[PDB]
Design a protein around this ligand. Structure first.
Ligand SMILES: Cc1cn([C@H]2CCCN(Cc3cccc(Oc4ccccc4)c3)C2)c(=O)[nH]c1=O
Ligand SMILES: Cc1cn([C@H]2CCCN(Cc3cccc(Oc4ccccc4)c3)C2)c(=O)[nH]c1=O
Lengths: 191, 191
């Protein structure tokens, strides 16, 4: 059972991962988590963050370049994800491939059917062989405005991916989602 | 003994690697080679080549992005290079870190003391921990002109790196270099 938590609000996404983990562990199922990017454990992830803050020349001026770094991050964790799914009952990922497609398409002002989204699905799932997630849970100066526009675009792209079952079945939940009900819906009792 | 062969002429660089290998094997020393980028064995290297030919969106529009891909290529071969240097007497690399600095600086119209060159030395040797080479042997429509200018710039950057001992001692040789003399100069008899 590989579950990926997506959304634009990271602080709430982290909370949902905590409440969801406690619910699964309360039901007797073992849980293990992993957050992307893997800052401090992957050189590709650290480079991306550093490029964001002006390092590495023009590396940040290419959306696909940054997306590639993120994709390479998960590529190095493939055997780590496979190991967790074999030794644990539930594996919860804080952000996954869907994040790369939603934010990449938003930056390029594209939709779910855009070139950037299809490229993400192609390179990470088909070429890199990243495990397909069983569930993808969507949690619904002047620079302050240039950001809010990217969040709304990313959030809309998220809504498109979930509506079309991008990379697997989805499940849209609000911040007020009940953890017990969500964990019972993702992994019902009696297998 | 880690030896790196550099230069702008790849066809001649490949020949020098062959003649140099035969000379070392004639002296009783065992030899093993490895060429960068590692097309077909590294996903980062293949992505770079594919980006060159129009794939991966704008990934190719960033020099540092491509340089990062090349650097990540060698980063994955670090333990492979260390294994060869332990089981073989001589390890000859067809292109190495110096290539990334010479061509990157040439594309950005920079010199050896430019930002791009220093970045290559910083990220690949200091951060990624790539083994320092004992020797770095330098082999000295309208689009046909836009290329010849890059080769001369790269060749000049090469000349600068070798003159200042960039990343280690260098050795400039022409295509007419004698293989027996070169192998005797890089690894003299009697240790
Ligand atoms: C795991 C993941 C996450 N993200 C976003 C999710 C929201 C937070 N950012 C943080 C971040 C890190 C590094 C660089 C960066 O700025 C960029 C990213 C891409 C292009 C240009 C600048 C943003 C990363 C992606 O875009 N793709 C991913 O694959
Ligand atoms: C091993 C190596 C090699 N090269 C060059 C040595 C001369 C041949 N090219 C071939 C090549 C491959 C992929 C892309 C490419 O075009 C670029 C490269 C960088 C930026 C933009 C386009 C060229 C690679 C580097 O620039 N850095 C390296 O680290």
């Amino acid at each position: 059972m590989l579950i990926a938590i997506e959304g634009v609000d990271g602080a709430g996404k982290r909370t949902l991962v905590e409440k969801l983990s406690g619910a699964f562990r309360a039901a007797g199922r073992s849980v293990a988590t992993l957050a992307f990017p893997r800052y401090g454990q992957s050189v590709a992830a650290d480079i991306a963050a550093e490029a964001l803050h002006g390092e590495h020349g023009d590396l940040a001026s290419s959306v696909y370049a940054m997306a590639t770094l993120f994709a390479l991050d998960r590529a190095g964790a493939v055997h780590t994800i496979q190991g967790l799914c074999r030794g644990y009952d539930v594996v919860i990922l804080d952000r996954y491939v869907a994040s790369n497609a939603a934010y990449s398409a938003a930056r390029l002002h594209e939709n779910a059917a855009g070139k950037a989204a299809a490229w993400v699905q192609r390179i990470e799932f088909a070429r890199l062989g990243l495990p397909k997630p069983d569930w993808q849970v969507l949690l619904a100066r002047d620079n302050y405005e240039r950001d809010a526009e990217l969040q709304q675009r990313t959030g809309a792209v998220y809504a498109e991916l979930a509506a079309q079952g991008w990379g697997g079945r989805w499940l849209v939940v609000g911040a007020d989602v009940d953890p017990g009900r969500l964990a019972a819906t993702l992994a019902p009792p009696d297998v």
